[PDB]
């Protein structure tokens, strides 16, 4: 219990009655009270009274923290300077100091911008290192680097409870919900504690997000300290971007410590175990050469059929299937079949010269130019296929070596990409200065220096892509130039973290929607994705723009932006009407594992009547699954059974059977409604192992 | 304040649940739609 | 608290779900349509652009289709749209979604996937290569050209997790799922069970590849009722319609027949024979080790201190189930909230242990022949 | 169909059987010989409280019946 | 809870301004010649 | 007002039953005895108030909707009247409180 002996103890203002009631209330504070603090309305008058007045602060924060207060609740603790693993400690530490210190860190982290919240914050950090429960105390102490000294404060014993838990939930919520400038603190102090820790591919994912060059030297003196070996060569090469294997091969070409990291981490290693084992552990049958190879001839689906048989790779059979298949083939299909031998051969350095050499310097411009194209396809570590085309390149309008400049300048964009590799670009100054009426000259100009130019140091607005900005706005002709030049512009904008290059090109470039389409291309390729919903509702606003191609690319940005929280990626784009919008979602599925909701959207997107959008479905439909697979194939046989429809059928047989290298070439494939010359640039889309 | 239900044995009661068509499980419909539902039954 | 986010996303999904001329020839077809579009029923189809229909009372007419919707959508026994003037067939009507579909066709992948197991991963492998591999990756059947297994029998003690496995395969699904309780096949009429079989597997056949699961199928052979006209000479005929249905004719199709019993001995060996059901699957009470896994699953999302060993709940009782362990968890929670605590201590598992094991853990009336 | 009409006549009887007036004395006296084929939802308080059979007579009762009829 | 609740609030905020962002002759004359046809009971 | 009684001398209407409305501003009505009829809406009504098993006032000539009718069915009230369980409260089962 009864409150009859103990309720009127608040009624005298005597100090000894307080100084023996408050340790007694501390003893009864293990359950708080008998009840939900029905003393509040009588002891709020005691606010004005002041020996053990910090114990009066403990009573006051106990009762105000017992009912409710967002700023007056932690005030007796920040005036108290907390003084005097339990149930009592679970009360005034694990829940009262957690909610109370949480609203103090939130209300002052949003209010002022002191050190009292740093002392109490490290006091709760220490107190929850006593309680030892992560992943709620952690996500509460994020919003007060502070997190850096928290990680070197807490990371002593629990390696995986902050490694597997905190870095996954907090990296996932840090690309999902937290904005950018704290992810750098995640990456750097994660480099600290993960530098103190083993299992180095967590630091290599820190290389995927940092793109740091000190990390690769530390992880290679440390990953030579940890002697599988070629396997971390393999996902080293698949994990890395285009810059840090050239920076890596120059700092390791200096030191290299065994030279076997020069062997692994440029080329030839990430591919020497695979292709013989690709022959060994797997066995493919001749009845897709014969069945999918007996899908009928019209010299267009023979072209695409030889393209399907070009991606059979139980050997290099289609490299040496006789003659008169390419003799039936036309010019950019002669690029396709002169490059098909390289598309069978993404290995065999020495064999590439002696298989392509029959088709080098031949009687046909597309045999030789597609042959040097295949020389760009086969490898990325030769630099001896540079000069037989690199010496020929100069034509100044419309000669053979401009097509060999297509396949060879693009093939050297495939083969090499430095930190900023520039002699090929000084060769590119008479290429963009050449400006042939063939589109793919400036096409593979922007795409080639853009493949060198991805992963750049937050991009640049240097004179290379600035030169193709001014020489782009030189001529407003053949609007595929106004589409495929901001391709490579935005590729140079890639490597951004914080680029205001969208504002720089938004001051230089913008005009009538060719160059406002350049504006929306930089808007796409400079904004790869974070928690940045402001441009997602801006995306919703300029989604309704009357120009229906900045709709196409600007809304096409979605599969780049929200590729991780992919529950949001299904939208009502099929429920929209601007049919290229159904194209946009039809891009936004992608090449991944392809869930039943994705294939359920391919049920309706499979059934559409235009040959361009009907041509747009089987690419991602069979690309997302690279019977089960052949059931939509025979369903397309039921859809048509023009040559566009037989060509999408061959496209589906083809595709059936954040690394930038798999991010570029489909965005290079986004202007499909055009010539078989552009279908000569269809055979460039290398993104598979 | 739950809907008190008593479904004992009658074709009347089956006609008020469904029409006596196949089963009783439209009582699940009238119980989810009256989700504070207390049902009582006999021997 | 996140109730603002939950109720905000709920009201946002509700209003967004509630967010649901130029074409002249379409308006001309709308003028071909009457404003009172009446509804008819097909009997036969005559190829000369007009067929025979049936009225609500049965006035029957030789009327034509508005030929922009397809007449291949029309089948004998489909509801159509009729005019009042010449009573012409206006167009295809969406079909009547019966209580057979709205009750039996479970649209929901119900509960947890294969992390809800204990003592499994052989039977998961058998349901995987017997059902999921004919479903998800039937390309090995192209590699060799060999038939899949047809039927699955689940059997064992009650509370084993036949329900758990049925809702796990009902979770990992891409086929239209159906569930039937085997006690539902006997009614107060003559000739009802076979009609339920015919329309049942007809509905299982018409839509898509489907997964038909029927549980407690032994409750038709060992149960008798006064609420039954005829008797064993109607039950036997229902078993005969299930017999010819399960081993019928004319390309049965991608309908996975999955059935569950408790006892196995009182069943028809003409239904145990392969050809109907090729995967008869033993369900034992697995092991005392994955007990701790079922304790880990059933205590994985509740506040609980250490206070116990699971070996104390291993060297306690010989049979083992999610029904046992789950009742230890729930009854321990009843003791914990009975003692108004969180972080459940040992004595709740002690009185929960004795309460559950006495609860059924007994026998007959003591002595007997111990 | 004919069973549904007798069913709804029983619905009319039951629905106008519980709640007549509670003051207006309508004395409904129903008679059968059979007590088997009956709904117990009829045999309810408020509907029908007393259950009166006419048993077979005995010696002296049949003597009095004979003294009356003869 | 913050990842799922925050991402769900992000998707709901995406659908909200999307909902706010929202705002033959094959046989027809022959059928018109079948309006002078007959019901044929 | 008395000259305005030919309004009361106008043709009456039908009571219908709305199962549910379908697209393009039409509804489905079964009347007192007949089949189902996809009939037309009026202007001064609400598609947002299309309720399942809702009676509406239906015009008899052109089958246009007129007014929504309340007091629909009461099925659980009807079965409650079929049962007539004794309405009980706390104060009448004295003599034991443990099971309570």
The answer to whether F37 contacts C38, with C-beta atoms less than 8 Å apart, is: yes
- How far is A186 from A209, CA to CA, in rounded Å? 10
A61: DSSP letter = H
Shortest distance between the Cα of D38 and any Cα of chain F, in A, equals 15
Phi first, then psi: what are they for A289, rounded to 5°?
-55, -45
Interface of C with A (CB under 8 A): 136-139, 142, 174
The answer to whether F76 contacts B3, with C-beta atoms less than 8 Å apart, is: yes
Give chain F's end-to-end CA distance (angstroms, integer): 64
DSSP C64-87: EB-TTS-TTS--TT-EEEE-SSS-
Instruction: Report yes or no on chains B and D touching (3+ CB pairs under 8 A).
Output: yes
- How far is C81 from C39, CA to CA, in rounded Å? 4
Find the angle CA(A250)-CA(A254)-CA(A257) to the nearest 5 degrees: 115
- How far is A452 from A467, CA to CA, in rounded Å? 16
Between chain C and chain F, the number of residue pairs with CB atoms below 8 A apart is 19
Task: Tell me the CA distances in angstroms from B17 to B25, B32, C203, F76, one per residue in order.
Answer: 8, 13, 24, 9
DSSP E22-39: T---SSHHHHHHHTTS--
Helices (H) and strands (E) in chain E, counts: 2, 0
Q: Which residues touch C169 (CB under 8 Å, ≥6 apart)?
A: C127, C131, C132, C211, C213, C258
The answer to whether C138 contacts A627, with C-beta atoms less than 8 Å apart, is: yes
Q: Are F31 and F58 in contact (CB under 8 A)?
A: yes
Q: Which residues touch E4 (CB under 8 Å, ≥6 apart)?
A: none
C282: DSSP letter = E
The answer to whether E35 contacts C85, with C-beta atoms less than 8 Å apart, is: yes
Environment class of A68 (CB within 10 Å of its CB; exposed 0-12, middle 13-18, buried 19+): exposed
| Helix H or strand E segment including A592 | none
Strands B37-40 and C62-64: unpaired
- How far is A8 from A1, CA to CA, in rounded Å? 15
Contacts of B11 in chain D (CB under 8 A): 7
* Chain C CA closest to residue E1: C2
Q: How many residues does chain A have?
A: 689
Give the other-Cβ count within 10 Å of A37's Cβ.
Answer: 16
Distance of CA A296 to the CA centre of its chain: 40
Distance of CA A311 to the CA centre of its chain: 26
Q: C149 among the known binding-site residues?
A: no
Q: Are C199 and C100 in contact (CB under 8 A)?
A: yes
Shortest distance between the Cα of A282 and any Cα of chain C, in A, equals 13
The answer to whether B30 contacts F75, with C-beta atoms less than 8 Å apart, is: yes
The answer to whether C39 contacts F40, with C-beta atoms less than 8 Å apart, is: no
The answer to whether C174 contacts A628, with C-beta atoms less than 8 Å apart, is: no
Sign, CA torsion A171/A174/A176/A177: positive
- How far is C55 from C80, CA to CA, in rounded Å? 10
F31: DSSP letter = -
Shortest distance between the Cα of C99 and any Cα of chain B, in A, equals 9
Chosen for mutation from B11, B12, B38 (greatest number of chain F CBs closer than 10 Å) is B12
Q: Which residues pair with A416 in a beta bridge?
A: none
Q: Which residues pair with C39 in a beta bridge?
A: C81
- How far is C334 from C239, CA to CA, in rounded Å? 44
* Chain F CA closest to residue C30: F24
Phi first, then psi: what are they for C281, rounded to 5°?
-120, 120
* Chain F CA closest to residue C41: F35
Q: Which residues pair with C259 in a beta bridge?
A: C153, C214
- How far is A376 from A342, CA to CA, in rounded Å? 8
Environment class of A121 (CB within 10 Å of its CB; exposed 0-12, middle 13-18, buried 19+): buried
C277 in contact with E, Cβ within 8 Å:
no
Conformation bin of residue A494: beta by default, left when phi > 0, alpha when psi is -120 to 50: beta
Give the SS3 label for residue F15: strand
* CA neighbor of A83 nearest in space, from A111, A50, A54: A54
* CA neighbor of F49 nearest in space, from F21, F71, F75: F21
Give chain B's end-to-end CA distance (angstroms, integer): 25
Contacts of E18 in chain C (CB under 8 A): 16
Conformation bin of residue A458: beta by default, left when phi > 0, alpha when psi is -120 to 50: left
Give the SS3 label for residue A611: coil
Strand residues in chain B grouped as ranges (E)? 3-6, 37-40
Q: Which of F35, F40, F63 sits opposite C39 (nearest CB)?
A: F35
Task: Tell me the CA distances in angstroms from F53 to A122, F13, F43, F45, F76, one per residue in order.
Answer: 64, 19, 21, 17, 14
Find the angle CA(C295)-CA(C300)-CA(C303) to the nearest 5 degrees: 110
- How far is E39 from C86, CA to CA, in rounded Å? 5
Give the SS3 label for residue C152: strand
- How far is A414 from A243, CA to CA, in rounded Å? 13
Contacts of C35 in chain F (CB under 8 A): 39-40, 62-63
* CA neighbor of A524 nearest in space, from A565, A497, A553, A552: A553
Q: Which residues touch A233 (CB under 8 Å, ≥6 apart)?
A: A264, A265, A269, A270
Phi first, then psi: what are they for C247, rounded to 5°?
-120, 55
Buried b / exposed e along C64-83 (16+ C-beta atoms within 10 A): bbbbbbeeeebeeeeebbbb
Instruction: Report yes or no on chains B and C touching (3+ CB pairs under 8 A).
Output: yes
Q: Which residues pair with E17 in a beta bridge?
A: none
Q: Which residues touch A527 (CB under 8 Å, ≥6 apart)?
A: A502, A535, A557, A561
Contacts of C71 in chain E (CB under 8 A): none
Q: Are C274 and C98 in contact (CB under 8 A)?
A: no
DSSP A612-642: TTTTTHHHHHHHS----SSHHHHHHHHH---
User: In the sheet that F65-68 helps form, which strands lie side by side, from edge to edge?
Assistant: F13-15, F56-59, F65-68
Phi first, then psi: what are they for C280, rounded to 5°?
-80, 125
Buried b / exposed e along A244-264 (16+ C-beta atoms within 10 A): bbbbbbebbeeeeeeeebbbb
- How far is A10 from A14, CA to CA, in rounded Å? 9
Contacts of F39 in chain C (CB under 8 A): 35-36
Q: Are C88 and C114 in contact (CB under 8 A)?
A: no
- How far is C298 from A188, CA to CA, in rounded Å? 39
Interface of A with C (CB under 8 A): 596, 627-629
Contacts of E30 in chain C (CB under 8 A): 67
Task: Tell me the CA distances in angstroms from A4 to A7, A33, A571, A589, C297, one per residue in order.
Answer: 6, 14, 64, 71, 49
**Which tokens go with F12?**
């009456």
Q: Are A684 and A658 in contact (CB under 8 A)?
A: no
* CA neighbor of D6 nearest in space, from D37, D35, D29, D36: D37
F38 in contact with C, Cβ within 8 Å:
yes
* Chain C CA closest to residue F25: C35
Q: How many residues does chain F have?
A: 100
Q: Are A494 and A660 in contact (CB under 8 A)?
A: yes
Distance of CA A672 to the CA centre of its chain: 24
Q: Which of C6, C16, C25 sits opposite E19 (nearest CB)?
A: C16
* CA neighbor of A602 nearest in space, from A613, A591, A616, A617: A617
Task: Tell me the CA distances in angstroms from A302 to A326, A328, A643, one per residue in order.
Answer: 10, 9, 11
DSSP F35-81: -EEEEE--SSS-GGG--TTB-EEEESSS-BEEEE------HHHHHHH
- How far is A309 from A317, CA to CA, in rounded Å? 9
Q: Are F93 and F48 in contact (CB under 8 A)?
A: no
Phi first, then psi: what are they for F77, rounded to 5°?
-70, -35
Q: Are A445 and A409 in contact (CB under 8 A)?
A: yes
- How far is C348 from C333, CA to CA, in rounded Å? 8
List the subunits that have 3+ CB pairs under 8 angstroms with A.
C, E
* Chain E CA closest to residue A175: E3
Q: Which of C8, C29, C85 sits opposite E28 (nearest CB)?
A: C29
Contacts of F62 in chain C (CB under 8 A): 35
Distance of CA A19 to the CA centre of its chain: 62
DSSP A151-172: HHHHTTS-SHHHHTTHHHHHHH
Q: How many residues does chain D have?
A: 70
Phi first, then psi: what are they for C49, rounded to 5°?
65, -5
Task: Tell me the CA distances in angstroms from D7 to A386, D15, D42, one per residue in order.
Answer: 95, 12, 13
- How far is A670 from A233, CA to CA, in rounded Å? 33
Find the angle CA(D60)-CA(D65)-CA(D69) to the nearest 5 degrees: 150
- How far is A368 from A376, CA to CA, in rounded Å? 12
Give the SS3 label for residue C185: helix
Q: C158 among the known binding-site residues?
A: yes
The answer to whether F82 contacts B12, with C-beta atoms less than 8 Å apart, is: yes
**Residue pointed to by tokens 């599988």:** A228
Buried b / exposed e along D23-43 (16+ C-beta atoms within 10 A): eeeeeeeeeeeeeeeeeebee
**Residue pointed to by tokens 């929280």:** A565
**Which tokens go with A468?**
């193709």
**Which tokens go with A106?**
């939130």
Q: Taking every pair of C-alpha atoms in chain B, what is the biggest distance, in angstroms?
A: 30
Shortest distance between the Cα of C22 and any Cα of chain F, in A, equals 15
- How far is A171 from A629, CA to CA, in rounded Å? 35
Q: Are F81 and D15 in contact (CB under 8 A)?
A: yes
E28 in contact with A, Cβ within 8 Å:
no
- How far is C262 from C156, CA to CA, in rounded Å? 5
Q: Are A607 and A637 in contact (CB under 8 A)?
A: no
* CA neighbor of A324 nearest in space, from A304, A344, A302: A302
**Residue pointed to by tokens 């003599």:** F95
Helix A214-225 crosses helix A201-210 at what angle (to 10 degrees)? 170
- Rounded CA Rg of chain C: 28
- Rounded CA Rg of chain A: 32
C310: DSSP letter = G
Shortest distance between the Cα of C230 and any Cα of chain A, in A, equals 46
Chosen for mutation from B1, B2, B4 (greatest number of chain F CBs closer than 10 Å) is B4
Q: Are A472 and A482 in contact (CB under 8 A)?
A: yes
Helices (H) and strands (E) in chain D, counts: 2, 0
- How far is C225 from C237, CA to CA, in rounded Å? 17
Find the angle CA(A76)-CA(A78)-CA(A80) to the nearest 5 degrees: 60
* Chain B CA closest to residue C103: B25
Contacts of F38 in chain C (CB under 8 A): 36-37, 39, 81
Q: Are A247 and A217 in contact (CB under 8 A)?
A: no
Q: Are A97 and A119 in contact (CB under 8 A)?
A: no
Q: Are A273 and A240 in contact (CB under 8 A)?
A: no
Long-range CB contacts for residues A203-207, cutoff 8 Å, separation at least 24? A204/A232, A204/A235, A204/A236, A204/A239, A205/A239, A207/A239, A207/A240, A207/A244
Phi first, then psi: what are they for C91, rounded to 5°?
180, 180
Q: C163 among the known binding-site residues?
A: yes
- How far is F18 from A75, CA to CA, in rounded Å? 62
Q: Which of F75, F82, F85 sits opposite B4 (nearest CB)?
A: F85
**Which tokens go with C125?**
């492998």
F34 in contact with C, Cβ within 8 Å:
yes
Q: Are A292 and A656 in contact (CB under 8 A)?
A: no
The answer to whether D41 contacts F83, with C-beta atoms less than 8 Å apart, is: yes
Q: Are C215 and C159 in contact (CB under 8 A)?
A: no
């Amino acid at each position: 219990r009864d409150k009859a002996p103990v309720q009127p103890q608040q009624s005298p203002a005597a100090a000894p009655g307080g100084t023996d009631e408050k340790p007694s209330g501390k003893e009864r504070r293990d359950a708080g009270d008998k009840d939900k603090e029905q003393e509040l309305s009588e002891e709020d008058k005691q606010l004005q009274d002041e020996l053990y007045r910090p114990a009066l602060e403990e009573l006051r924060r106990q009762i105000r923290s017992s009912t409710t207060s967002m700023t007056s609740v932690p005030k007796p603790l920040k005036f108290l300077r907390p003084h005097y693993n339990k149930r009592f400690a679970a009360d005034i530490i694990s829940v009262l100091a957690m909610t109370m210190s949480g609203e103090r860190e939130c209300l002052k982290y949003r209010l002022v911008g002191a050190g009292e919240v740093a002392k109490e914050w490290q006091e709760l950090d220490d107190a929850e290192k006593v309680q030892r429960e992560p992943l709620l105390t952690l996500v509460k102490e994020i919003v007060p680097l502070l997190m850096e000294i928290e990680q070197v404060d807490m990371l002593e014993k629990d390696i995986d409870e902050n490694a597997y838990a905190k870095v996954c939930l907090y990296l996932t919520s840090c690309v999902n919900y937290v904005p950018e400038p704290e992810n750098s603190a995640l990456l750097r102090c994660a480099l600290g504690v993960f530098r103190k820790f083993s299992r180095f591919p967590e630091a290599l994912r820190l290389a995927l997000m940092l793109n740091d060059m000190e990390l690769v030297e530390d992880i290679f003196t440390s990953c030579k300290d940890v002697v599988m070996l070629g396997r971390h060569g393999v996902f080293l090469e698949l994990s890395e971007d285009v810059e840090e294997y050239e920076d890596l091969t120059e700092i390791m070409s200096n030191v290299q410590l065994n030279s076997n990291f020069l062997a692994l981490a440029r080329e030839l290693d990430i591919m020497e175990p695979k292709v013989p084992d690709d022959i060994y552990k797997t066995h493919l049958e001749n009845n897709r050469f014969g069945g999918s190879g007996s899908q009928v001839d019209s010299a267009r689906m023979n072209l695409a059929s030889s393209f399907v048989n070009g991606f059979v790779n139980q050997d290099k059979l289609l490299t040496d299937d006789g003659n008169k298949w390419l003799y039936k083939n036309k010019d950019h299909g002669m690029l396709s079949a002169a490059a098909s031998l390289g598309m069978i051969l993404l290995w065999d350095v020495d064999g590439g010269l002696t298989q392509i050499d029959k088709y080098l310097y031949s009687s046909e411009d597309y045999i030789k130019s597609g042959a040097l194209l295949a020389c760009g396809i086969v490898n990325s570590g030769v630099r001896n296929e540079c000069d037989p085309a690199l010496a020929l390149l100069s034509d100044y309008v419309l000669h053979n070596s401009n097509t060999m400049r297509l396949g060879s300048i693009f093939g050297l964009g495939l083969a090499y990409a430095g930190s900023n590799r520039e002699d090929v670009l000084t060769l590119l100054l008479p290429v963009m200065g050449d400006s042939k009426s063939s589109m793919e000259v400036a096409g593979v100009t922007a795409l080639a220096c853009g493949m060198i130019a991805v992963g750049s140091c937050n991009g640049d607005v240097t004179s290379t892509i600035l030169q193709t900005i001014m020489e782009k706005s030189e001529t407003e002709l053949k609007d595929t130039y106004a589409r495929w030049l901001p391709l490579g512009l935005g590729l140079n904008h890639l490597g951004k973290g914080e680029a205001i290059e969208a504002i720089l090109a938004a001051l230089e470039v913008v005009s009538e929607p060719f160059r406002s389409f350049a504006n929306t291309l930089v808007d796409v390729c400079a904004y790869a994705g974070s928690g940045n919903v402001l441009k997602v509702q801006q995306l919703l606003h300029i989604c309704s723009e009357h120009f229906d191609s900045k709709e196409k690319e600007e809304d096409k940005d979605k599969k780049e932006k929200k590729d991780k929280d992919k529950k949001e990626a299904p939208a009502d784009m099929g429920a929209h009407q601007g049919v290229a919008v159904l194209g946009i979602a039809l891009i936004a599925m992608g090449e991944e594992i392809g869930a039943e909701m994705a294939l359920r959207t391919f049920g309706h997107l499979l059934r559409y009547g235009e040959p361009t959008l009907r041509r747009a479905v089987p690419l991602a439909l069979a690309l997302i699954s690279v019977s089960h697979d052949a059931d939509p194939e025979v369903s397309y046989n039921s859809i048509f059974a023009a040559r566009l429809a037989a060509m999408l059928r061959q496209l589906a047989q083809y595709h059936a059977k954040k690394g930038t290298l798999t991010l570029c070439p489909y965005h290079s494939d986004r202007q499909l409604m055009s010539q078989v010359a552009v279908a000569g640039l269809l055979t460039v889309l290398v993104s598979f192992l | 304040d739950c809907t008190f239900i008593r479904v004992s044995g009658s074709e009347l009661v089956q006609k008020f649940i469904g029409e006596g068509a196949r089963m009783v499980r439209e009582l699940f419909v009238m119980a989810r739609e009256h989700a504070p539902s207390i049902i009582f039954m006999d021997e | 608290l996140e109730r603002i986010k939950d109720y905000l996303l709920m009201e946002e999904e509700f209003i967004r779900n509630q967010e649901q001329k130029q074409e002249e020839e379409r308006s001309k077809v709308d003028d071909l349509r009457g404003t009172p579009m009446s509804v008819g029923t097909l009997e036969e189809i005559i190829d000369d652009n007009h067929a025979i229909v049936s009225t609500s009372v049965g006035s029957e007419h030789y009327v034509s289709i508005l030929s922009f919707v397809d007449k291949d959508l029309l089948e004998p026994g489909c509801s159509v749209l009729l005019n009042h003037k010449v009573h012409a067939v206006i167009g295809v009507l969406m079909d009547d979604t019966d209580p057979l579909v709205t009750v039996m066709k479970v649209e929901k992948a119900p509960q947890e996937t294969y992390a809800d197991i204990g003592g499994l991963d052989n039977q998961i492998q058998e349901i995987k290569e017997s059902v999921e591999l004919p479903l998800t990756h039937p390309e090995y059947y192209e590699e060799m050209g060999i038939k899949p297994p047809k039927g699955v029998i689940l059997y064992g003690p009650p509370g084993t997790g036949k329900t758990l496995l049925a809702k796990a395969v009902a979770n990992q699904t891409s086929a239209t799922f159906l569930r039937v309780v085997g006690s539902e096949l006997i009614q107060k009429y003559l000739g009802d069970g076979p009609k339920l079989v015919r329309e049942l597997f007809r509905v299982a056949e018409e839509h898509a590849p489907s997964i038909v699961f029927i549980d407690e199928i032994d409750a038709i052979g060992t149960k008798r009722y006064d609420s039954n006209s005829g008797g064993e000479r109607e039950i036997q005929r229902t078993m005969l319609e299930l017999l010819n249905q399960l081993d019928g004719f004319d390309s049965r199709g991608d309908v996975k027949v999955i059935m569950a019993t408790n006892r196995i001995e009182t069943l028809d060996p003409a239904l145990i024979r392969p050809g109907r059901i090729d995967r008869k699957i033993e369900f034992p009470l697995p092991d005392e080790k994955t007990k701790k896994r079922i304790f880990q699953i059933h205590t994985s999302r509740m506040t609980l201190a250490d206070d116990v060993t699971l070996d104390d709940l291993i060297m306690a009782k010989d049979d083992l189930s999610g029904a046992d362990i789950k009742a230890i968890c729930t009854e321990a929670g009843l003791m914990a909230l009975r003692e108004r605590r969180m972080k459940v201590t040992n004595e709740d598992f002690k009185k929960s242990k004795e309460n559950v094991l006495y609860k059924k853990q007994e026998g007959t009336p003591e002595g007997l022949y111990l | 169909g004919a069973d549904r009409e007798v069913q709804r006549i029983l619905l009319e009887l039951l629905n106008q059987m519980d709640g007549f007036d509670q003051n207006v004395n309508v004395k409904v006296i129903m008679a059968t010989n059979r007590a088997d084929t009956l709904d117990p939802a009829l045999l309810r308080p408020g509907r029908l409280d007393r259950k009166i059979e006419f048993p077979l007579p005995d010696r002296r009762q049949k003597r009095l019946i004979f003294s009356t009829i003869t | 809870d913050d990842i799922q609740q925050l991402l769900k609030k992000i998707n709901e905020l995406t659908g909200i301004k999307e909902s706010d962002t929202g705002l033959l002759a094959a046989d027809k004359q022959t059928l018109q010649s079948e309006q002078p046809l007959q019901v044929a009971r | 007002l008395r000259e305005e009684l030919q309004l009361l001398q106008e043709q009456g209407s039908y009571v219908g039953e709305v199962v549910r409305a379908m697209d393009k501003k039409k509804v489905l009505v079964k009347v007192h005895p007949e089949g189902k009829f996809v009939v037309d809406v009026d202007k001064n009504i609400d598609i947002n108030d299309v309720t399942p098993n809702c009676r509406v006032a239906l015009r008899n000539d052109s089958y246009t909707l007129h007014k929504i009718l309340p007091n629909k069915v009461d099925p659980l009230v009807s079965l409650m009247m079929v049962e007539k369980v004794p309405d009980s409260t706390y104060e009448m089962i004295g003599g034991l409180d443990k099971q309570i």
